Design a protein around this motif. Structure first.
Motif, PDB file in Angstrom:
ATOM      1  N   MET A  61       0.851  -1.223   0.000  1.00 55.62           N
ATOM      2  CA  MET A  61       0.000   0.000   0.000  1.00 55.62           C
ATOM      3  C   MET A  61       0.868   1.247   0.000  1.00 55.62           C
ATOM      4  N   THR A  62       0.372   2.313  -0.617  1.00 59.52           N
ATOM      5  CA  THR A  62       1.099   3.565  -0.752  1.00 59.52           C
ATOM      6  C   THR A  62       0.486   4.628   0.151  1.00 59.52           C
ATOM      7  N   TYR A  63       1.159   5.778   0.217  1.00 58.36           N
ATOM      8  CA  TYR A  63       0.617   6.906   0.965  1.00 58.36           C
ATOM      9  C   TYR A  63      -0.743   7.323   0.423  1.00 58.36           C
ATOM     10  N   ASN A  64      -0.931   7.232  -0.895  1.00 56.82           N
ATOM     11  CA  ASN A  64      -2.181   7.684  -1.496  1.00 56.82           C
ATOM     12  C   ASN A  64      -3.360   6.877  -0.979  1.00 56.82           C
ATOM     13  N   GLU A  65      -3.213   5.552  -0.927  1.00 59.77           N
ATOM     14  CA  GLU A  65      -4.320   4.707  -0.497  1.00 59.77           C
ATOM     15  C   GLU A  65      -4.724   5.022   0.935  1.00 59.77           C
ATOM     16  N   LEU A  66      -3.745   5.143   1.831  1.00 61.04           N
ATOM     17  CA  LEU A  66      -4.038   5.428   3.232  1.00 61.04           C
ATOM     18  C   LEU A  66      -4.658   6.813   3.393  1.00 61.04           C
ATOM     19  N   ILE A  67      -4.076   7.811   2.725  1.00 58.53           N
ATOM     20  CA  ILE A  67      -4.570   9.180   2.835  1.00 58.53           C
ATOM     21  C   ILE A  67      -6.012   9.254   2.360  1.00 58.53           C
ATOM     22  N   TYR A  68      -6.289   8.691   1.185  1.00 61.96           N
ATOM     23  CA  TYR A  68      -7.626   8.810   0.628  1.00 61.96           C
ATOM     24  C   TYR A  68      -8.617   7.903   1.338  1.00 61.96           C
ATOM     25  N   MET A  69      -8.159   6.811   1.950  1.00 65.43           N
ATOM     26  CA  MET A  69      -9.063   6.032   2.786  1.00 65.43           C
ATOM     27  C   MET A  69      -9.513   6.848   3.988  1.00 65.43           C
ATOM     28  N   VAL A  70      -8.571   7.528   4.648  1.00 62.13           N
ATOM     29  CA  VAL A  70      -8.935   8.388   5.772  1.00 62.13           C
ATOM     30  C   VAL A  70      -9.871   9.499   5.307  1.00 62.13           C
ATOM     31  N   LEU A  71      -9.540  10.133   4.179  1.00 62.78           N
ATOM     32  CA  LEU A  71     -10.360  11.233   3.680  1.00 62.78           C
ATOM     33  C   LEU A  71     -11.765  10.767   3.323  1.00 62.78           C
ATOM     34  N   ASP A  72     -11.881   9.627   2.640  1.00 61.97           N
ATOM     35  CA  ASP A  72     -13.187   9.139   2.229  1.00 61.97           C
ATOM     36  C   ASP A  72     -14.014   8.700   3.423  1.00 61.97           C
ATOM     37  N   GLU A  73     -13.375   8.146   4.454  1.00 59.66           N
ATOM     38  CA  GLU A  73     -14.120   7.818   5.661  1.00 59.66           C
ATOM     39  C   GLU A  73     -14.607   9.085   6.352  1.00 59.66           C
ATOM     40  N   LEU A  74     -13.782  10.132   6.361  1.00 65.93           N
ATOM     41  CA  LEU A  74     -14.235  11.442   6.817  1.00 65.93           C
ATOM     42  C   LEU A  74     -15.101  12.162   5.792  1.00 65.93           C
ATOM     43  N   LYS A  75     -15.137  11.685   4.548  1.00 64.84           N
ATOM     44  CA  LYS A  75     -15.863  12.343   3.460  1.00 64.84           C
ATOM     45  C   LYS A  75     -15.399  13.788   3.289  1.00 64.84           C
ATOM     46  N   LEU A  76     -14.084  13.991   3.344  1.00 64.29           N
ATOM     47  CA  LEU A  76     -13.485  15.293   3.056  1.00 64.29           C
ATOM     48  C   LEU A  76     -13.145  15.391   1.568  1.00 64.29           C
ATOM     49  N   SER A  77     -14.189  15.321   0.742  1.00 65.40           N
ATOM     50  CA  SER A  77     -14.012  15.272  -0.704  1.00 65.40           C
ATOM     51  C   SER A  77     -14.006  16.648  -1.352  1.00 65.40           C
ATOM     52  N   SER A  78     -14.757  17.600  -0.812  1.00 64.67           N
ATOM     53  CA  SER A  78     -14.830  18.918  -1.423  1.00 64.67           C
ATOM     54  C   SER A  78     -13.494  19.631  -1.291  1.00 64.67           C
ATOM     55  N   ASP A  79     -13.034  20.232  -2.390  1.00 60.96           N
ATOM     56  CA  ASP A  79     -11.811  21.023  -2.343  1.00 60.96           C
ATOM     57  C   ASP A  79     -11.932  22.211  -1.398  1.00 60.96           C
ATOM     58  N   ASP A  80     -13.154  22.637  -1.088  1.00 59.36           N
ATOM     59  CA  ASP A  80     -13.403  23.706  -0.124  1.00 59.36           C
ATOM     60  C   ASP A  80     -13.612  23.141   1.276  1.00 59.36           C
ATOM     61  N   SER A  81     -12.677  22.304   1.714  1.00 61.85           N
ATOM     62  CA  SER A  81     -12.719  21.663   3.020  1.00 61.85           C
ATOM     63  C   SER A  81     -11.619  22.229   3.906  1.00 61.85           C
ATOM     64  N   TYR A  82     -11.923  22.350   5.199  1.00 63.13           N
ATOM     65  CA  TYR A  82     -10.946  22.909   6.124  1.00 63.13           C
ATOM     66  C   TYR A  82      -9.740  21.992   6.271  1.00 63.13           C
TER      67      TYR A  82
END
Lengths: 32, 225, 225, 225, 32, 32, 32, 225, 32, 32, 32, 32, 32, 32, 32, 32
Positions: C1-22
């Motif tokens: 697994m790469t940094y991308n998979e872990l980062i985006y798994m955390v983001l998707d679980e938080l649903k921090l998808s909008s570019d206008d996110s804090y």
């Protein structure tokens, strides 16, 4: 909600631990 | 069972049926592959137990002779190594490299640290040794120059990433299975209900969480948008 | 697994998808590396266990000869130090410095305090030593003057920062990987669900917290703005 | 990691982004520097454990010869002392004063009380001793008049105030880092998530508390104004 | 919400400690 | 709210204490 | 409200006492 | 850290920013010093531990020769006492009186009760003694008449009042610091978060309590006015 | 809802462990 | 609702276990 | 309301008591 | 509702087990 | 309402009893 | 409602059991 | 309502009992 | 309602049993 595939195993394991504790005290005595 | 059955069991428990779903099957594959290793470590690390045959996978490697460092004369003897990077094994099972026949041959899979110093025993000068270098390749070492002719080995172990080792899966009689979904997932059935429960718990909460849904140059999660 | 998979798994679980996110992916990267170190120490400091190869990581170092204090005749013998600063290691695994072949060479990596009084034993006079000095570089010392000729080494260890050691990673056969997001995250898959859970718990509450939204020369947080 | 990353992690966990915020980054620096020492004492005071390299800092001192009391003949032998006041070390690590080379020289950092009576042993009449006087300076003492020529030393310890010892940080190769925010914070990663949690808990409650907001010659906190 | 990647391992560790306590009382006696 | 960087460590430390208590009772007997 | 500068140290002290109790039962036996 | 930083940290956490506030910084100063003493005794009285240099503090004393009772031929030998009253010490550290050089001189500081029966031993007849008498001054006694010539001493200890000992602090190289707020608060940074928590808890409830606001010759507190 | 096909067996197992613990303390003495 | 055909048996079994534990401590002493 | 000048001391005293109980069990064994 | 024809006997049995446990520790000593 | 002139002394007495229990287990051993 | 003709007897019996347990530990020592 | 003339005495008596239990374990050892 | 003519005596009896248990552990030792 409900799903008991991890509760069942943990309860079974707890009972296994308690069973092993019980049987570990068993002795066949001597000096009659 | 296959990746497809586990994936769609998780999806149907979660009812992620619409194509317009935030959590795609790729999230399911990621969570399944990680929770598999999590459960296997939790069960087979405390004390030594019998590991079933379902937890294992066989990868097939193609070996190439490589210099120890470079092409210098004094840089030591050469090693064989797998052409491609090899998955990392877990330390719970029975790793074994075999010469395409599990019931024959002696190729020993040892730790990285041990393989620095092996074969000094005069009776162990003909045993091939294996380990995964920090490079990520499986390196081979022995004192018997015959080993350098070896061309193909198969490695059976409980690999830490089911996806990687399944991608490196050995050719079947019918042929290669292109899609990962049609390959066989590496886990015993007695660990499948817990695995599904853990993954479904992992994604149940996030499934119903709010989104930053308005396109307004604003963070809309504090307002539960 | 790469940094991308872990980062985006955390983001998707938080649903921090909008570019206008804090909370951007850099928050996720920082939290992931710090919780990686936290989990590794929590698991492998209480008592001694096996560390898998996945928590280990490698760097490439270029060595330059430097004076002990400055250029003077009586300031002591010179040292060899890495050109760039070296990440701090975690005292839980098998740190090792090797001359680009893991299965060869003995360059010991010892404590900085021990490295003062070393080499006096007659049979230890040809052993090369290492320790990360307070300057931040990895200094080398030995009594066999040949060590100063050494030009390039590698260093395997469970590093404190995954990001710092990832930036200093050894070149691959294909080449260098420009993006940190395309590099392999150094943690075992058995520790990944705990890590994701901890980081998601770190950012869940803040994700829905109020912000000081109004531009009115006033603090609007007490009013839950 | 640097002061900037920790500071802005705390701020973003608290969402203190507006310039019109009651709690500025200075509060964050204060709380971080105090909670660092708090955590380090809590972890490394109960029983003796390995202290990583991240908890330490090197300050560089410039020494000046000073009289024991005044310029009298009978007022005792003179001492060297650092030009500026020195930070107070914690008693958990491995304090060491070294002559700009950590791997050489013997300057002993001892307690204030011990240094009253040192060097009477005939074999210890050439050892330089150090301690922080109640004046706040690092005083040097020995029976070998050569010590008074010493001009520069560097002191490596787990200093009790990260801000003070970072302000006294030693010049780097590139040059001095003017801003404290660009310097490196002194703590292991395994202690960073707890540190952020403690600071964020410390300021979460106060963040949403009411203010005495009306300018009416009145205390307005009882009314939750 | 829901996540058991930290509670499961703590429960497993608790039951492992119970396992070790139970099996540490096992003795094969002597003096018959 | 939520953050488990101090709850996790305290639970892990509690389990470490209980593990040390368990293994401290282990003995390899004698007098056969 | 929230503040853990007094609860954290008390929890740490409790676990330190548990640590000392656990390691105080450790014995290296004799009479083999 | 200085008194100002601690005081304003407590105030800002309480948000007592308005000049029209019931609780001024003097309440904060009083509570901080009393809780300092409380915490020091709570930590360093149960069993003996190391006291860092930060909880210690220094004062300058000027000694004057005084009669034991009054000027009479048979009232006993004279004493030396400090001109001004001396703060009470805490029986937890290493109280010491030194002749302006910490690393020189032996002026013992003993209990007041012990100081009656002292110096009879033939080898203890040149040792100078101290004890804070019920008058409040620090009296000096010895059998070697040279002690009466002594004119000026210093006193290091963990004093009961940080404010009283701060007012009597030794002059610095730059000079005297006029404002108490610009002096160093005598507590270790590992004890600061507990102190701030205790004081903020002391003043949190009262900060929002009702006041007797009406000027009507009546007690308005039962009505929550 | 209601179902006792898992609670009944766990209760029975708990009482079986109690049974074995109770009968493991039974001794027929000597030295009269 | 109510039905006590399994609660009664489990309570009776618990009391039987506790009774067996009680009577298993009984001894008729010696050495007068 | 709140003031923790008596809760803190009592918790600290409880922990002191428990620490003294822990260290009072420590022994340096003999008969090797 | 109300009925004590099953709780009364269980309480009585519990107290009978306590009775037997209490009287099973009674010893008339020797060696004076 | 509020008053701690009776609870404070009872808590202090409880901790004093704990103090005496803790220090009553302290032994300076023999037979080295 | 209320009637304490069975609660009183059970509490009295519990106290009798505890009293018998207390007095059953009493001994008049020897070997001076 | 409130009156603490019987609560105070019972708490004081409980603390007296616990104090007597504590001091009853005290011994001045022998065999040095 | 209120009445303490039955609770007072039960509390007194409980504390009397605690009294007898505490004083039953008192021993005047021998072998000095």
């Amino acid at each position: 909600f409900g799903s008991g595939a991890i509760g069942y195993e943990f309860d079974n394991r707890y009972l296994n631990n308690q069973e092993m504790s019980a049987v570990a005290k068993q002795r066949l005595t001597s000096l009659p | 069972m296959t990746y497809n059955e586990l994936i769609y069991m998780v999806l149907d428990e979660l009812k992620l049926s619409s194509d317009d779903s935030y959590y795609t099957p790729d999230h399911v594959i990621f969570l399944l592959v990680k929770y598999r290793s999590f459960l296997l470590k939790q069960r087979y690390s405390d004390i030594k137990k019998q590991i079933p045959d379902s937890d294992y996978q066989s990868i097939c490697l193609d070996l190439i002779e490589v210099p120890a460092i470079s092409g210098e004369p004094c840089e030591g003897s050469s090693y064989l190594r797998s052409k491609n990077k090899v998955p990392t094994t877990m330390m719970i099972g029975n790793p074994r490299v075999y010469p395409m026949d599990f019931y024959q041959g002696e190729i020993t899979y040892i730790s990285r640290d041990r393989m620095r110093y092996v074969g000094y025993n005069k009776f162990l000068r003909n045993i091939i040794y294996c380990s995964k270098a920090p490079d990520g390749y499986l390196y081979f070492k022995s004192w018997n120059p015959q080993f350098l002719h070896l061309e193909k080995v198969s490695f059976n172990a409980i690999f830490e990433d089911a996806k990687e080792a399944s991608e490196m899966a050995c050719p079947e009689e019918n042929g290669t299975i292109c899609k990962l979904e049609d390959k066989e997932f590496p886990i015993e059935d007695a660990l499948v209900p817990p695995l599904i429960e853990l993954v479904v718990k992992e994604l149940r909460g996030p499934e119903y969480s709010p989104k930053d849904e308005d396109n307004n140059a604003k963070d809309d999660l504090p307002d539960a948008r």
